[PDB]
């Protein structure tokens, strides 16, 4: 059984590792080149709308480790130096005319990988662009010289060695010298003595040294010119502007301190890091800066340094002559912990958070001119400065970029009423964690939401005049009455509209230039602009069943299938036709095309019958109410809609099917799709100034033509019951949709289809959630290191309040009344959390449909849950139990545990409440719980045990202790047990029913730091890797299940593939109705991918040759080798990189012609064959 796979990415990584800013486009506009994990991305923040748009996104197929920008003297465009996991340094130039990164230079100096002594981790550039220095973590440092030629093109020189044996580098930074010899300051630490002293005395009292390396340009050689030891170890440096602007020098950020230390006769200046007033953190914990941003002006310059608590300070340096006098820090604001920050002109700050969403703020004030205390290095104290954190008062949130990093669990299931499965993603970081629901489609912007009484069944939006550029009324039809609203910029309820709906309403339209028409089951009501009402009673005891309105026509269908036709005279009144036609059966839906501007009436009338047929009827007076063409349907119609782009008749049936049909005197060609599970309703909407149609079944789909090429894209939104086009000053082009018991004003701004989200905030970092089959709800465990439980936060906060009074200050001061009162928002001001053995774990029952949490269970202080499951036991009835594996007093480094516990819950009220059953203890942490044959398999340490349910505790029924290291996960087919060792890959264990004896009958030949897995069949397991790999391991068919260097029979690895991002969830599922199963994986960088099987050997050979061609014609951007990158830890086995293949569309046309002609094809054929994979296994909304 040959198994060849094909990888593709659906949601590229959203977590940001680096972020630089500059004039990369070569204009006045400033862009932000950010680096995700393995993807280089060019973003542009708009100074007008304040939104961040992704200009470019390129997959580099390599590990980006350092990112810098520079500019030559007299230059107007910034280049991009990229330090990678390749043995090469690359200098790139963005091209706006071609929207691509042009690799200007690439030099090869070392081996591939994130190596110890191979440069690529650190990258510092001379602020005048004359030289660049790329350095490793240890022992190797190289310097290239940058000079432009006569054609103004950048040129690079040969490398200059600056190596120094037994040296570790904490950080490298180029020093701003005013066109002097280039200087590179860096933090070093010599470990030669620490390794040759068995006492450990040389290990201690060994501090790092700030060293200045000079590039002698006249002599063309680098020399370790300067060096001085530092008082305490520092984490990073900051380039202080020198030359004409400011004094040269570096800022050394250090544990609880910051030190300006320019060399020469400049004295070291230090200032303590200010701490927040009344820290809930452990006082033994220090405080460092996580990142820094620098803004340079011809007038002044300042810095913005963020702490571990997200505290951004505005650091300023006062200076006299060429020397610095003092370091002046001032509390700026607080944002989430950022991995990088960029201060841009026109007053904008880009904050790329280390985890979770990213943010773009507008600098309203510099942070001075307020009365907040400003600290200085010259201020004496011995004690640190204290400040008060406050809400955002110097920045305003202008844009928020949704990032899924880090994704820790993922279940792709259809929990909502829709048909396409949703991606339920447990992802986040501490207090900013969340459970986000992902639907792939068009983003819906909720303009307004208001609940409605009773059960609404319809809605319309009517203008007051034809020349009105905005609608006037929103009509909502219930069962026994209709409510009329006026969009008067306040959406007030109105009564004098004239509709006066004491009955349900079938239609509301604008007939005359200013006349309104309401159609209700008891008849027709005409409302002139002048408040005149002309009624129309239904003939006899009948009622009108259906209707079709128009700008100048009103067709109606009454019980018994009796049509009545009304036409408006140019004199403004309606005249009924002199004839009434009967049908072969009752009418269930009608549609009447809009009148063209020049013409005075529409000719065609679509009428669907209970006969399961649609019929076209002419309304021209030559053949008024005469049959034109009939058409049989596979089921009963539900709605009809005629629309132009060339006339199309749309049919939505009572089963979920939709049909488009050509139209004119006769209706001919046809297409259909399954939209089904729900009857398809059809509504006219105005999209992008054109007429689009909106289908409504299990999801709301939008069909619209695009360059004579249709599109049917679903909306990433819940099910809706009705919709109508909307236009107001608040929302110029929107859609009014009523759903079950709610009225919603929506808008379709974005046109591209992506994974859209709805986020449910959590309290702690989630580890796992399980699907309760009956309740369809979620049981989530949220565990965090270094944390306090809520009770400990209260008792500790209060304890501080008591200790506040013991100062005996005239006793008359109650600052505790302001301290105990305000609980600072934990999500924005960071989590008040500290401690090495401290933890915080919480069990939560959440409904996935809405955002509400059904139940909440707060655990003890030092208890940390790592496993959870929902199942039933054979000995008991159909009662659902929730088992939660917890650990006690976890010292993570070095590892040491006190014990573990297992909570058992009864989950009564069909998954709405948890009630405490018992808490059974155990000696080691249990990190794996799985239901198995009416009983539960629990993994405690390296021991795999079979447990049954008891009235007092979970009784141990079986045990196995021959597992190598530690159980991280366990999944079981009905008969076998697949154990995931923390280090020794997968272990196959059979459970003997007769003796309760777990027997290991197979294991792996390779060690694998497993993170997650999923059983593909009875013999194959797909597993993820801590190092970012994915494998598929298959048992040979001759494996004997009943038996009694590790095990006898081994399992062969049939697939190896390095993804490049650590995968934490594998799931074999179908993404869309009608498609095929795919191996969808999530990753720790907030990315979603799929692995896809080939159906024929011809396709495998085709895409494989595409891979071989693009490996040489389109090599990775950062000098990495593609085959080597995908063979990082294990050689590639039966995977084709589809992310590389889809770059065929990005090559130059001559390369597409060469590669395609080599495969005896054309570039469009290659592109379509690449699209077929996405059509089969992913999302393709192309509607012929």
């Amino acid at each position: 059984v040959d198994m060849f796979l094909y990888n593709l990415t659906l949601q590229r990584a959203t977590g940001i590792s680096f972020a630089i800013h500059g004039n990369f486009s070569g204009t006045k506009q400033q862009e932000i080149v950010v680096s995700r994990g393995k993807i280089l991305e060019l973003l542009r923040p708009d100074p007008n709308t304040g939104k961040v748009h992704t200009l470019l996104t390129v997959e580099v197929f390599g590990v980006i480790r350092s990112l810098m920008a520079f500019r030559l003297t007299g230059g107007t465009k910034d280049y991009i130096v990229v330090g990678s996991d390749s043995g090469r340094i690359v200098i790139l130039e963005y091209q706006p005319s071609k929207n691509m990164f042009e690799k200007i230079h690439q030099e090869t100096f070392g081996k591939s990988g994130c190596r110890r002594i191979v440069p690529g981790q650190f990258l510092a550039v001379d602020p005048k662009g004359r030289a660049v220095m790329i350095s490793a973590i240890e022992k190797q440092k190289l310097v290239y010289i940058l000079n432009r030629d006569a054609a103004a093109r950048l040129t690079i020189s040969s490398p200059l060695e600056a190596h120094k044996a037994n040296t570790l580098v904490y950080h490298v930074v180029g020093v701003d010298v005013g066109f002097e010899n280039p200087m590179f300051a860096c933090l070093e630490m010599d470990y030669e003595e620490a390794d040759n002293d068995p006492t450990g005395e040389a290990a201690a009292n060994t501090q790092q040294t700030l060293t200045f390396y000079e590039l002698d340009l006249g002599l063309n050689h680098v020399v370790r010119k300067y060096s001085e030891p530092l008082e305490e170890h520092g984490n990073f440096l900051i380039t202080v502007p020198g030359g004409s602007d400011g004094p040269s020098g570096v800022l050394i950020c250090s544990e609880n301190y910051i030190t300006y230390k320019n060399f020469g006769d400049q004295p070291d200046i230090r200032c303590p890091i200010p701490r927040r007033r009344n820290d809930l953190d452990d006082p033994e914990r220090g405080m460092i800066f996580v990142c820094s941003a620098t803004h340079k002006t011809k007038s002044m310059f300042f810095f913005l340094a963020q702490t571990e608590q997200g505290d951004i300070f505005k650091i300023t340096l006062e200076t006299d002559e060429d020397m610095v006098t003092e370091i002046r820090l001032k509390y700026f604001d607080t944002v989430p912990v950022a991995a990088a920050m960029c201060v841009l002109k026109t007053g904008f700050l880009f904050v790329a958070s280390e985890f979770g969403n990213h943010y773009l703020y507008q600098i309203a004030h510099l942070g001075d001119d307020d009365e907040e205390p400003e600290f200085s290095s010259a201020m004496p104290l011995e004690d640190t400065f204290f400040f008060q954190p406050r809400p955002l008062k110097n920045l305003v949130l202008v844009d928020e970029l949704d990032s899924l990093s880090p994704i820790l669990f993922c279940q792709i299931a259809d929990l909502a009423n829709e048909d396409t499965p949703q991606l339920y993603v447990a992802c986040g970081r501490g207090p900013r964690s969340s459970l986000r629901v992902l639907r792939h489609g068009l983003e819906v912007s909720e303009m307004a939401v208001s609940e409605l009484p009773g059960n609404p069944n319809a809605v319309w939006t009517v203008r007051r005049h034809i020349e009105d550029e905005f609608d006037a009324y929103i009509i909502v039809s219930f069962v026994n009455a209709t409510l009329v609203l006026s969009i008067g910029e306040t959406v007030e309820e109105v009564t004098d509209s004239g509709f006066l709906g004491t009955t349900p309403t079938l239609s509301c339209s604008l007939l005359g230039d200013d006349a309104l028409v309401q159609v209700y089951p008891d008849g027709i009501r005409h409302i002139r602009a002048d408040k005149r009402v002309n009624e129309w009673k239904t003939p006899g005891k009948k009622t009108i069943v259906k209707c079709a309105v128009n700008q100048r026509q009103v067709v109606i269908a009454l019980t018994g299938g009796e049509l009545v036709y009304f036409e408006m005279d140019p004199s403004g009144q309606l005249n009924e036709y002199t004839e009434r036609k009967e049908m072969s059966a009752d009418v269930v839906c009608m549609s009447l095309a809009n009148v063209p501007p020049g013409e005075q009436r529409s000719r065609f009338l679509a009428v669907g019958l209970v006969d399961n047929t649609v019929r076209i009827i002419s309304l021209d007076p030559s053949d008024c109410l005469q049959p034109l063409s009939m058409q049989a349907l596979p089921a009963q119609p539900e709605s009809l809609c005629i629309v132009e782009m060339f006339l199309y008749l749309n049919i939505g049936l009572q089963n979920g099917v939709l049909l488009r049909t050509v139209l004119d005197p006769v209706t001919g060609d046809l297409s259909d799709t399954r939209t089904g599970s729900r009857p398809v309703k059809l509504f006219r909407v105005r999209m992008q100034g054109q007429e689009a149609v909106l289908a409504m079944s299990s999801r709301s789909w939008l069909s619209y033509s695009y360059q004579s090429r249709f599109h049917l894209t679903p909306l990433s939104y819940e099910t809706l019951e009705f919709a109508s086009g909307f236009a107001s000053e608040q929302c110029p082009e929107g859609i009014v949709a009523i759903s079950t018991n709610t009225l919603r004003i929506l808008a379709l701004e974005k046109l591209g289809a992506v994974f859209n989200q709805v986020a449910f905030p959590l309290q702690y970092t989630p580890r796992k959630f399980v699907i309760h089959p009956e309740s369809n709800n979620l049981i989530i465990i949220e565990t965090d290191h270094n944390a306090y439980t809520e009770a400990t936060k209260a008792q500790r906060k209060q304890q501080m309040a008591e200790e506040m009074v013991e100062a005996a200050g005239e006793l008359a001061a109650e600052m505790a009344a302001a301290f105990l009162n305000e609980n600072l928002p934990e999500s924005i001001f960071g989590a008040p959390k500290a401690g090495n053995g401290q933890w915080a774990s919480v069990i939560r029952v959440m409904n996935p449909i809405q955002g509400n949490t059904l139940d909440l269970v707060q655990l003890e202080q030092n208890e940390a849950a790592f496993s959870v499951a929902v199942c039933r036991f054979s000995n008991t009835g159909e009662d659902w139990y929730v088992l939660v594996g917890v650990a006690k007093d976890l010292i993570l480094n070095p590892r040491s545990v006190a014990g573990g516990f297992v909570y058992t819950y009864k989950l009564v009220n069909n998954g709405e409440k948890l009630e405490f059953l018992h808490k059974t203890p155990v000696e080691e942490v249990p990190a794996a719980i799985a239901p198995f044959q009416g009983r539960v398999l629990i993994g405690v340490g390296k021991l795999l045990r079979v447990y049954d349910l008891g009235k007092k505790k979970l009784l141990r029924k079986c045990e196995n202790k021959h597992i190598a290291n530690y159980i991280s996960g366990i999944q079981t087919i009905g008969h076998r047990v697949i154990v995931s060792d923390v280090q020794e890959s997968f272990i196959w264990v059979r459970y003997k029913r007769n003796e309760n004896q777990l027997i290991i009958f197979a294991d792996d030949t390779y060690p694998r730091w497993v993170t997650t897995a999923s059983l593909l069949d009875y013999d194959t397991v797909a597993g993820a890797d801590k190092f970012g790999n994915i494998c598929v391991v298959r048992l040979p068919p001759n494996t004997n299940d009943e038996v009694d260097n590790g095990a006898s029979q081994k399992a062969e690895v049939i697939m190896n593939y390095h993804v490049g991002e650590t995968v934490l969830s594998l799931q074999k599922t179908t993404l869309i109705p009608g498609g095929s199963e795919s191996l969808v994986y999530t990753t720790l960088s907030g990315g979603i991918g799929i692995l896809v099987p080939f159906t024929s050997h011809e396709d495998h050979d085709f895409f494989q040759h595409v891979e071989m061609h693009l490996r040489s014609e389109h090599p990775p951007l950062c000098g990495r080798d593609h085959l080597s990158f995908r063979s990082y830890y294990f050689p590639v086995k039966n995977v084709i990189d589809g992310d590389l293949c889809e770059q065929f569309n990005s090559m130059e046309p001559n390369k597409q012609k060469n590669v395609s002609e080599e495969l005896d094809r054309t570039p469009p054929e290659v592109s379509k064959k690449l699209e077929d994979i996405r059509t089969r296994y992913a999302f393709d909304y192309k509607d012929d």
């Binding site: 977590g15 590792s17 994990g37 590990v63 480790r65 996991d85 990988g113 994130c114 190596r115 110890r116 002594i117 981790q121 973590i137 240890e138 022992k139 570790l168 904490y170 630490m189 470990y191 620490a194 390794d195 002293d197 068995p198 006492t199 450990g200 290990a203 060994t206 170890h233 984490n235 990073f236 460092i288 800066f289 996580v290 990142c291 571990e308 912990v337 280390e354 985890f355 990093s405 880090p406 820790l408 970081r429 501490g430 970092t765 965090d784 290191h785 270094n786 944390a787 989590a831 959390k833 993570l892 480094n893 801590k1026 190092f1027 970012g1028 991002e1061 650590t1062 990753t1083 720790l1084 960088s1085």
Partner: protein, 66 residues
Amino acid sequence: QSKYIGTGHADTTKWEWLVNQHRDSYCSYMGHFDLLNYFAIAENESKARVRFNLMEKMLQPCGPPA
């Protein structure tokens, strides 16, 4: 081969081997983004401080020799 740090010979002690692979491991953590992410999520510490402690564990790992 001798001038490549991490290379071994016949008289290489276990302490030298494991301090070698320990420093290699720490630098690999510094390199691969999602690895440092997993570690910075396990222990509730920011990426910066995790990198800092990984750099402090460079002359410290396995303690002093014999």
